[PDB]
Design a protein around this ligand. Structure first.
Ligand SMILES: CNC(=O)c1cc(-c2ccco2)[nH]n1
Length: 164
């Protein structure tokens, strides 16, 4: 069902995450971690203290789909054992030093063709698929986008609900 999922999304904040490659989303799904540019890291740290849930919605560039979504379970931290991210052409590993712990809520994909009716007021009401890495998605758009994903029956939201 969808009732526990709606409870987790209640009064959440939502951020679009754009990855240049599938390898980093696969690593994030396996290890429960994410890293982003410092500008976005500052935004996520602010949001994590401000809201009951901060939701990251993942899209690999050029894939035409979202690959799932996850809830922040910590602010960023540095100095842990380094994660072997695949780094884009012109950026170093010091940029992605801040590591967030995340709990996956859905590891299933959603094609952009299924979200074409949802627009993001915080990006000029462009379709929600459009936006830079770190773009915040307004509450109603973000909630409806998450509810479009196929249910992930492998995930038990009971443990996430406790962290809230
Ligand atoms: C593990 N984290 C990443 O792979 C990543 C990449 C980017 C990015 C922003 C702009 C171009 O690439 N943001 N996060």
């Amino acid at each position: 069902g969808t009732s526990k999922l709606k409870y987790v999304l209640q009064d959440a904040r939502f951020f679009l995450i754009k990855s240049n490659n599938h390898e980093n989303v696969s690593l994030a799904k396996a290890k429960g971690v994410w890293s982003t540019l410092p500008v976005n890291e500052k935004k996520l740290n602010l949001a994590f203290r401000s809201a009951r849930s901060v939701i990251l919605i993942f899209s690999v560039r050029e894939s035409g789909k979202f690959q799932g979504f996850a809830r922040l379970s910590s602010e960023s931290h540095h100095g842990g054992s380094p994660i072997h991210w695949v780094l884009p052409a012109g950026m170093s590993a010091k940029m992605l030093g801040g590591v967030f712990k995340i709990d996956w809520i859905c590891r299933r994909e959603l094609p952009f063709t299924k979200s074409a009716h949802l627009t993001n007021p915080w990006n000029e009401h462009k379709p929600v698929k459009i936006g830079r890495d770190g773009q915040e998605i307004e509450l109603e758009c973000g909630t409806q986008l998450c509810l479009l994903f196929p249910p992930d029956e492998s995930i038990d939201l009971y443990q996430v609900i406790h962290k809230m």
